[PDB]
Symmetry: D2
Subunit: 120 residues, 4 copies
């Protein structure tokens, strides 16, 4: 299932609980970036996925502020859980930083993260 501890391809740690109501809650600890210790995440998932072989859609957000550091930025991951012998969460993400208007054209990074229950 979705609930558990997952790792992306860089070794970041995603600790998430899927609630009966469609909620995602937990913590994220990034292996890269202007980031240290755990950050709060919240998100949503499809609690009644199709029964045709399709994955389970989900998304979550981290704002990169905790008690230690503040990078004035937020990542959102949008993707799907794919069950199976080696379960995976396949995502694309958008990181936006707060910027001045003059710098807004370069406010947003895009990437892709794949999560498994094994750490690199």
């Amino acid at each position: 299932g979705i609930t558990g501890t997952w790792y992306n391809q860089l070794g970041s740690t995603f600790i998430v609980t899927a609630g009966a109501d469609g909620a995602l809650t937990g913590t994220f600890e990034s292996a890269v970036g202007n980031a240290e210790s755990r950050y709060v995440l919240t998100g949503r998932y499809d609690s009644a996925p199709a029964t045709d072989g399709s994955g389970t859609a989900l998304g979550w957000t981290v704002a990169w502020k905790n008690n230690y550091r503040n990078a004035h930025s937020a990542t959102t991951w949008s993707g799907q859980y794919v069950g199976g012998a080696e379960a995976r969460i396949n995502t694309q993400w958008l990181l936006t930083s707060g910027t001045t208007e003059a710098n807004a054209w370069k406010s947003t990074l895009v990437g892709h993260d794949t999560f498994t229950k094994v750490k690199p």
Copy 2:
């Protein structure tokens, strides 16, 4: 913070959000009940003081008690205050797919929200 309240895009969508003291975003995204969905996200509760906007993001899973599109959208963006306050976002909509169809699982776009 200036975020709490009702925001509108230019395509007929509304949401309603509360920006908690703790960096939480909670609320609803709509157009009637069949068009309303739970939203949850996070924002920077201590933004820079150099004129920069406030980073934030949120998720809607497109499931409610009336329908289920087996999909989710995330909006990632920044709040800009002032005379003309705005939330400027880019978004990713992922649908559940089979692995054979995963290449076509995700739409990307942009949307700007205003208070009027």
Copy 3:
């Protein structure tokens, strides 16, 4: 439709020719040092149902004066009419080490008009 001089919302200038084969060629920039080659493709036989015309192009940010070790691609569609528009999304990738590849790519959106 597509051939002409276009401007985005930040005042960049996109000078393009749409060839009979599907080719796009031109320059993206007022000074010489800020001018770069672009090349791309478009749908030379779009639908006849009111839909736009799909297209895309690339600029590598190297010219005879400057090199940013980066390239942008714009993907979008041409919408004709009294006020023609090209609506795009873009990806800017900079060369990075492997370790840094997660932060290689910016994304945005640009709208072009002939004014």
Copy 4:
């Protein structure tokens, strides 16, 4: 290092020539499934361990088929014994204005020489 034949994991192949002036020219085979490719690359990349920035476009029209769409790939070439082109891509379809909000898919793809 870019000139030659590249493969993904989904059955696509392309052949490209990286010209001395920064041009990319070639053909992309999706699977009558061959299409013109054109783009640009950094002809004077750093030699510091960084990749070589590049991009290209395929409009999905040939003499047989037309999807009324175009993909752009933006990425970097990484050389060495196991060379790769790592990309993110945008596929835009021609749409009416009412449907423009759903005109563009996004994804990623990696190409190899083997």
